[PDB]
What does this fold into?
Amino acid sequence: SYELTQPPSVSVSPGQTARITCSGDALPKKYAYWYQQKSGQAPVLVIYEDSKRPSGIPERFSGSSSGTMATLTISGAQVEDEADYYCYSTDSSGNHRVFGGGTKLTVLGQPKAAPSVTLFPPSSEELQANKATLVCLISDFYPGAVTVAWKADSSPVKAGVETTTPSKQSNNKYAASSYLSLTPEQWKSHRSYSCQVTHEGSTVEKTVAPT
Amino acid sequence: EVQLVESGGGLVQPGRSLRLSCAASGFTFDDYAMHWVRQAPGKGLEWVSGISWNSGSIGYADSVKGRFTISRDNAKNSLYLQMNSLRAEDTALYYCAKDSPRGELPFDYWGQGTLVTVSSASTKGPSVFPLAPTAALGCLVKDYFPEPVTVSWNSGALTSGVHTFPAVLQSSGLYSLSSVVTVPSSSLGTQTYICNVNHKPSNTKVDKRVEP
Ligand SMILES: [Cl-]
It folds into this structure.
């Protein structure tokens, strides 16, 4: 019911300052808390009561909160700081413990690399079977975070979009895929459909048409 | 010195029950609020349930209220979670966690988790469609359950330039994946391309010829 909103991802160069925000309606009357979860490990408390460090936590970690927002700041990011960060608070009633959706923090550790994007139209066979799937294949990207938007002609498509989490490839880069399900009618009635992949502020779009 | 170790997780079918335990050592378990927090594969953290030191105060997530029951035995230094009417959506790693005294530091120590997988025993085989074409082609392996499916090309004679993508779990509860291969465009009218899809759970194997 009650939600805490965080940016899905943040990139930072080693030694630079990373900021992760957390937005929630009850935060004006409630404390915020931050947890770090490295790959394959249990979470660890790094900030409590908006801005306090538990014993043992490095001083490069700091927090602040005002109104409906709390901010986790890491001043001088180390590679070992690469992890997912969750903000935590209770709902207004104080009956529910809620985490934000979490923020994936990449501390850049290999060459950046734009994603390659391959888009396939529905096959004759599938159409001939009264179904239609667009396949957007996204590979060789780093950092491992991407957002995928879809377009019908020039309009946003949101329903029927299914998109995986990025996976580490054999070469330490990342891959992901997005599927758009349509009725054959929907597909044949537009001049084109487009897959838009956003990576580190830049966007690559591939489009296909019923031809 | 502090230690939280959980157990009881496993593979079960929907509707069934499971009982999780958590053993606490290196501290006076009796003095602390205890919690279950869960995390589905690739997803965020979700509070499940909490219980005060003397069991006087108990809370549940709305998604589990009425199905799960938390309890503890201070003499036995153990936190429990009785899970009834399990659903596929309950699949997660289940963490045990404690609060500091007075709750100043919530979840200040966590176990490593015990894994709970809830899966129908029913199976659906894949519909395999060609992804038709210096050139890329592949196969759409659509609407199957459960994992895994393996894919090869030309009975494994073609390995160079093959990229099989991790599947999407669709809202329907069914999986789909694609395998693509990069090939010479000049070799498209000559070579025949066949993806070999293997879905052991449904005892199905499919060889799809991919044509331009
Ligand atoms: Cl506050």
Summary: The CA atoms of residues 131 and 138 of chain B lie 5 Å apart.
